[PDB]
């Protein structure tokens, strides 16, 4: 049975406290293992979130994944690697529905803007088995999408078209595709790999997504200069970017020229969440959010500046913090604290506390002496989660000097009454659950503290005879040494600066 | 008629417009271009007049 219950509701929160390190994870994933809807766990940080896109897949099998992050900063001037782009855009096409299965967000693409459904369902296609449609026909489809034509297609975004044999490699999907048009028709959608350049099998229908994020043809080219001549203005110059896509080229920072090329308002990608999803928060989104929004204005003030490439306020590219928390209102919430929160309802505490210090050391004799003292006085079961299958080795052998050999299970619910239990993950800090008397001794609950020291006071013995006591009564020109440097003449006292 | 002739319509689009004009390259921002005008002529150490 459960320990709590699942918030389906407008905008109300369900507060889960007295949690520590690695066991969000496990809360989120019973949350995915229980429930029916999308979870998108939105992380205080993007760097915090990655280290829970290994965690989660360490207690669960459910589907996860990332939206992939542009790694440049707000008001950069880098291209974000269209890979990436590849990446971050396939979850926007399955984001519409996906019925279980987690995603996990950092708050800052959680409130940027992203292009609306028009675009992406609009320059999306399919292309199956039986389709009259012709050769040169589906590449200048391609070209109106956007893709680039070489003859040796190995990355996103590339096509090859020769005589009546085609390829492409969709953005959405992740294998390129060899087509092979006859009578004006498609005869076959053939799966060949970047490495082997032969067909491994052979798929009825499959789906193409368009270059990126924005439209590139022509009309929408006119568009950028007629919504760019309204809002900025223009100076003729071959680095200024108005001119510089009046040539076709498009510039490095140009990811943040988004709403120009749309004329009409980017959504929020709340449209992106399917109706009953559910969101979970880790740290306090207030904070770091508005710290965000901060650095963006700073940086969009310092950058504000330099005619040659101006830039956009941000309260149309970036969502503004009040507007977040009230868009947040429309789905429901569930807050993990590493805090004891006091007592409401929609409110329990779970008592997922921390471990006892099982630091191992060589000083001592007997190096596992708290983890032996600790395990057998324990009354429920202990699990490990090695990080790697070599390292189970340093596992083995280290719990040979107490003899004791732990089982290998998958799921932490295999746990039994009591016993020693041994699993892969990645998770870094065990914790003790009170309600089924858990245990969880992660890999660096052993090796916790880095310790830097030397050596300190070798011939500081200060009661010699000779140490003259410090008494400050000596005769100017009594010889004198100093430890460090040597014996020499006292000279008196002097004031200096 | 200096004014009707120059370009630039207040002080932090001067500032940008004497960074371009110093140093070809470059993209201005802010605090370069703040910190470039500030130590040309108001620098105890990069210019002195004995």
């Known amino acids: ?497 | 008629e200096t004014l009707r002739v120059d370009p630039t319509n207040d002080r932090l689009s001067a500032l940008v417009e004497i960074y371009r004009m110093m140093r070809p390259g470059e993209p201005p921002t802010r605090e370069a271009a703040e910190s470039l005008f500030e130590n040309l002529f108001f620098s105890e150490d990069r210019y002195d007049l004995s």
């Open chain 1, 1 to 497: 049975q459960y320990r709590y219950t699942l918030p389906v509701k407008a905008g109300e929160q369900r507060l889960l406290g007295e949690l520590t390190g690695a066991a969000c994870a496990t809360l989120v994933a019973e949350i995915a293992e229980r429930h029916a809807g999308p979870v998108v766990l939105i992380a205080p940080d993007m760097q915090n979130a990655l280290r829970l896109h290994d965690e989660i897949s360490q207690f669960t099998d459910q589907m996860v994944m990332n939206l992939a992050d542009w790694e440049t900063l707000p008001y950069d001037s880098f291209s974000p690697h269209q890979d990436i782009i590849s990446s971050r855009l396939s979850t926007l096409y399955q984001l519409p529905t996906m019925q279980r299965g987690v995603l996990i967000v950092p708050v800052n693409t959680l409130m940027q803007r992203v292009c609306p459904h028009s675009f992406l369902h609009g320059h999306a296609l399919v292309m199956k088995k039986g389709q009259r449609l012709s050769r040169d026909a589906l590449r200048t489809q391609l070209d109106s999408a956007g893709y680039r034509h070489v003859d040796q297609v190995m990355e996103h975004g590339e096509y090859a078209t020769r005589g009546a044999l085609l390829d492409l490699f969709p953005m959405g999907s992740e294998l390129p595709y060899r087509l092979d048009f006859f009578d004006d028709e498609i005869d076959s959608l053939r799966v060949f790999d970047v490495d082997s350049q032969r067909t491994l099998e052979e798929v009825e229908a499959i789906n193409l997504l368009p270059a990126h994020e924005f439209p590139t043809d022509k009309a929408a080219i006119e568009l950028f200069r007629s919504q760019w001549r309204d809002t900025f203005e223009v100076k003729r110059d071959p680095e200024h970017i108005y001119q510089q896509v009046s040539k076709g080229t498009l510039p490095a920072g140009i990811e943040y020229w988004q709403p120009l090329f749309f004329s009409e308002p980017l959504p929020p990608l709340f449209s992106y969440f399917p109706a009953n999803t559910l969101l979970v928060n880790t740290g306090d989104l207030e904070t770091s959010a508005e710290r965000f929004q901060a650095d963006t204005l700073a940086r969009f003030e310092n950058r504000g500046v330099d005619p040659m490439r101006p830039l956009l306020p941000p309260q149309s590219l970036w969502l503004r913090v009040d507007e977040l928390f009230s868009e947040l209102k429309n789905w429901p919430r569930v807050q993990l604290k590493t805090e004891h929160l006091p007592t409401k309802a929609a409110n329990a505490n779970l008592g997922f506390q921390k471990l006892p210090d099982l630091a191992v050391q060589a000083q001592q004799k007997a190096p596992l002496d708290a983890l032996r003292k600790f395990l057998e006085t324990f009354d429920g079961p202990v699990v490990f989660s090695v990080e790697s299958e070599g390292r189970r080795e340093a596992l083995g052998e280290l719990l040979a000097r107490i003899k004791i050999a732990p089982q290998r299970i998958m799921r932490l619910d295999e746990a039994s009454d009591r016993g020693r239990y041994l699993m892969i993950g990645a998770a870094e800090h065990g914790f003790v659950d009170t309600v089924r008397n858990l245990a969880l001794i992660c890999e660096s609950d052993l090796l916790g503290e880095r310790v830097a020291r030397r050596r300190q006071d070798s011939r500081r013995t200060i009661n010699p005879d000779t140490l003259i006591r410090n008494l400050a009564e000596l005769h100017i020109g009594q010889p004198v040494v100093h430890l460090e440097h040597g014996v020499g003449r006292y000279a008196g006292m002097t004031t200096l600066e």
